[PDB]
Amino acid sequence: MSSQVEHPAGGYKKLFETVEELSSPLTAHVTGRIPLWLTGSLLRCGPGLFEVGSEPFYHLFDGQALLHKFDFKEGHVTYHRRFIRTDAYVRAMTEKRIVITEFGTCAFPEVTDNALVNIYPVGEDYYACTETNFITKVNPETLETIKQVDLCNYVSVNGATAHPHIENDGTVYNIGNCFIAYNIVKIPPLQADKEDPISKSEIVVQFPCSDRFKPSYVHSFGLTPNYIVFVETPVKINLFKFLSGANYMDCFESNETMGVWLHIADKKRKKYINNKYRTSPFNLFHHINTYEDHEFLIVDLCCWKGFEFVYNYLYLANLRENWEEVKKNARKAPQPEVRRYVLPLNIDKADTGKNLVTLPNTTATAILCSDETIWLEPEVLFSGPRQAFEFPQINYQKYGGKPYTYAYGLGLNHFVPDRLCKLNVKTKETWVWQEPDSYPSEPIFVSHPDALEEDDGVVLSVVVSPGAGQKPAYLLILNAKDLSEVARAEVEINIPVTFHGLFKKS
Amino acid sequence: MSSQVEHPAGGYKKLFETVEELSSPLTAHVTGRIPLWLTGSLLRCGPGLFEVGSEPFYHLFDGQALLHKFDFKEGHVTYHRRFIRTDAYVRAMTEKRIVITEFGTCAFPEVTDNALVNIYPVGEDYYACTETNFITKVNPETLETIKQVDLCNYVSVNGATAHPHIENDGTVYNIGNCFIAYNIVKIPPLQADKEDPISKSEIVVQFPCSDRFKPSYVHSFGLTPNYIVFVETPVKINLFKFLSGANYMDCFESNETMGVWLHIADKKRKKYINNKYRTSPFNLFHHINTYEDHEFLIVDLCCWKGFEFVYNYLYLANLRENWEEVKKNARKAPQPEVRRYVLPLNIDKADTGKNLVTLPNTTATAILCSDETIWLEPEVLFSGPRQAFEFPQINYQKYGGKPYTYAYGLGLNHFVPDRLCKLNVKTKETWVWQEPDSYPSEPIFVSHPDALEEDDGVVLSVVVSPGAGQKPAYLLILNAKDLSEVARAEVEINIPVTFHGLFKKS
Ligand SMILES: CCC[C@@H](CCO)COc1cccc([C@H](O)CCN)c1
Ligand SMILES: CCC[C@@H](CCO)COc1cccc([C@H](O)CCN)c1
Ligand SMILES: CCCCCCCCCCCCCCCC(=O)O
Ligand SMILES: CCCCCCCCCCCCCCCC(=O)O
C-alpha cells in the first residue's frame, strides 16, 4: 504494498498535460550508478496531446500517442520522444480539430489507430498499438513512424489486445473479438525467406462467447507451454449500439448475473476444452503470469472486485480533480485485488460436490457441481483499500508461462500511480518504493546477464516529479532484489503518463 | 499463522481415546509462574467416553460429555473432571449399551442431550449444552449434574446453538431452527424476584428460510448493540429424512446453487430487515466478532470454502488414521479462510450497479444489483493451505459487538489441532505458539482485571502432549501480547479433545 502518502499538492495533474516532442535526444543527468551491463532502449507509449486547439479529449485513453525512448550506454542516458504519425494524429494536425473518434471522445464533422498503449516486436519490426484492428510500425532508433497495418487484411478479428504474448523464438500470440467468438491469432517468427511474418498470421483456436450478441471486453490473456487461458468478464460490448454521436465508451454495459467465466484451450492440439469454470464478478485488465503445476493451471490476476466498468472512473476531468475529490470519486469503484485461481485439468465425475484443488501449497478451490460447472474461489495474494497492485511485470523471458515467485507492479492510490511494488507470490511478502509527490509508471524488469536467481536484475520506471527544487521527471532504476534505488536519470522537461513498453537490448 | 510441524508419530489419536473421571481434584505441577491475579476456574466440555463396552461411537460429536475444570488460586492449580449425568450417559451405564442415537451413531434396540460442546451462564446457573432442545444444569464447583432442561417447555424452537451471546448484564441471546424459520431466543438477566430466568424466555425476532422444507444448519450468529446477524449457509437439514436406522449426519445435504445468504435484524426494534445480502458458498461454524462502523456491519467469520459439509471429514475412523492418510483425506475438503464481510445498512437505489462499501480501511465490497440482491466479496484476513484459524476467541467482555483488533484461535493442520494463533484483524499480522507432538485446545482470553488495552492479559489452553518423557497433558498459559509462554501446569493423566468453555472469575 500500500501507499503511505497523500497528494494534496495535486502534482499528478502533470500526468495529463500536453507536452511537445523533441527534434533529437536530450542528456539525462545521472545520480547514483546506471548499471554498466544495461545497454539498450526502454521504449514506452502513452498519450501526449490532450487537446487539439480548443477541442478537448475527455478520456485517459484518447490523447494522441507519444513514443518515448530512454537509451542506456556505458552508464550514460538519453531521452527522446516523438508523436506517432497515425491517421488520427496527422489528420488532426491537417484539419486543426479532432477528426477521428477516440475511445471516449466523439469527433464531430472510421476506427482509431491512436497507438498510445504499448509497443511489441514482430519479426525484426516493432509495432505501437492500441486495441483496434490498426497497429503502427515504428522505427525503434529514430522513433519515426513507418506505416499503418490493418490486421483485418490478414486474419479474421475486429481488433486485438495491446498484450500479445511473445515466445522466445519470436512467435507472437494475441486474442481479439470476432463479429461471435474470440480468436487466438498466431504470428510466426521471421523465417529464412524473410517475408513479413504478419502475412503468415493465422487463427489457431477459437473461444466461445457467453452471449450471442454481446462479446466481453478483453484486455489480456494467459499462456503456458501447453495451454491458453481466457477470462470472460461481465463487462460487455453492446453490438446493437456499436454497429449503428457515440464513442467507444458508450457501447459498454455490465452483465449483472453471469459473473466471470474462465476458458482454457489446448495450445498444441489447437482445441477448446469444454470445462465450465465459473466464479464471482470482477473486471480484469492484466494477467500477471500463468503456469502448469501437476495438471492444474495456476492463473495469477490483477482483479477489480465488481461488475461496473473500471474505465468509468478514468475520464480526465475526474483524474484532474483535487486530491479529496479523487479519493471521494473512487469510493464506489470496484476494489483492486491480486488473486490466484487454480484450474483443474482432470475433472472426475466421482468428485462431484468436492474441492478438486488437491495441491499442497494453495487455498484456492474449485468445486465440481452437478450441472458440471466448476465454481472457483481464489487465493488472495495482495489486497489494500483502493491500493491497486497494477501494470504487473515479471522476469518474462525466463519465467513467462512457468512456475515463478516474483511480480513487480505499479501501485495505484485511488487510481493515482504513486509507488512501485514487488510481490512474492508464494510468501505474500511485499516491498515498496515511494517518494512524496512522485508519480511512477509501470516497472519493467531487465535481467543481469550473469543472473542465477529470478530477481537478479533491475526494474526501470519513468517518474513524474513536479514542484520546484526537483527537475520535472526522471528515469528510475531500482534493484529488483529489494526495490532499493540504484540510480536516476533526470530530464528537464515534463513527461506525461505512459502505459506499457519494453526494454530492447542492444 | 500456519503450522510448521508434521505428526508422523500419530499422537493426536490420544484426543479420541476414552478416559476415566476423577473422584476429586488433582494437583497440577506448575513450571514458570501462574499470575497471582488469575483467580477462578477454566471450565471446558468435550467427549470423554468413545465406546460403550464393545459398541463404538463413530463421529467426533458422539462421545459422552465430560466436564473439565482447572482451578487457579494464589499461583496453584488443580484439575478435575466428571462425566455429565445426561439421559444418554445414565441410560448407557444402566443398559450397558448405546441407548440414545448420537450425531453420527445410530442406537439399535428420543433426542440426545449429550452436552459435550460448551458451557454458559444463565442467571446464577451454568448449563452444559450440545445443539438440541436439551441443556444440562451443572454445578461449576463440584461438577455435579443438577438437572435436564427442555427448551421446548419454554419457547418455540427445535434446538438452539452451543454459542449463545451473553451481554454484560447477563442477558442471553441464542438462535434455533423452528419447524419453517429461525428464531432468536432472549433469556433475561436474573431479577429481584429470583425466578429462573429460563421461565421468562421469549422469541424476539424471526429470520426467514431460503427453502420452505429445508432449514440451514446453524452453529453461531453475530450480535452488536443494535443488530443481529445470521448467516444462512448451503448446508441443509433435510426434514423429509429428519422426521422419518438413521442418525443426525444422515439428514444433511448441500444446496449447490444458493450460495450464502446473509440476514440482519434490528435488535431493539425486534424487526427483520429485508436486505438480500448474497455471496459464494462456504460452511460457517464460528463467527469471530461483529460490529458497527458508520452505517456498515463488519462481520468477521471463520469460513470453509465450499458447499460440502465439513463434518463429513470428522468421523473418528478418519481422525484416528496415520498422518499421511489424514493429510490425504483432507485434500478434497473445503479450505479454511478467515474473511471479513461488510454489510451496508443504507442501500440507495441510485447506486445500483456500484460498490456500496465506502469505508476507507477495507477491501470488502457490496454490489447493489437490479433485482435488489447485494452481492458481497470479502476481505481475506488469514488463509493458509489446510491451516485453519478456528475456535476463535476475543476479549469478549469488553470488545464483543464492538470495534476490535485482536482474535485468538486454535490452529488446525488438516483438521489436527497443533498450535495456537493470534491475528491482528487490522494489520493481518499473526503470532504462533507451537511445540512438536502437542495438541492444544481452544484458547480462552482472560484480561488483567485492571487492563485498559485490548490484549493485556493471558490465554489459557489445555494441551495434550503424549510424547514419552513428558507428562500426558498440561494447562498452558501464554501472554496475550505475543503468545510467549508464562507457565504450564502438568497433570499425570490423559485429557481428550475439548471444544468450548469459559473462564469463571472468583
Ligand atoms: C467498443 C470497444 C472496442 C474494443 C476493441 C474490440 O474490437 C476496444 O476499443 C478501443 C478503442 C480505442 C481505444 C482503446 C484503448 O486501448 C482502451 C484502453 N487500453 C480501445
Ligand atoms: C440434523 C441436525 C440437527 C441439529 C439440531 C437442530 O434442531 C444439530 O443436532 C445435533 C445433534 C447432536 C450433536 C450435535 C453437535 O453439537 C454438532 C456439533 N457441535 C448436533
Ligand atoms: C499510469 C496510469 C495511471 C492512471 C490510470 C490507472 C488506472 C488503471 C486501471 C487498471 C488498468 C487499466 C488498463 C490501462 C492500461 C492499458 O491501457 O493497457
Ligand atoms: C479441537 C477439535 C479438533 C478436531 C476437530 C476439528 C474440526 C473443526 C472443524 C470446524 C469447527 C467445527 C465445529 C466444532 C466446534 C463445535 O462443535 O462447536
Ligand SMILES: [Fe+2]
Ligand atoms: Fe494494459
Ligand SMILES: [Fe+2]
Ligand atoms: Fe463451536
Ligand code: NA
Ligand atoms: Na520513501
Ligand code: NA
Ligand atoms: Na516452537
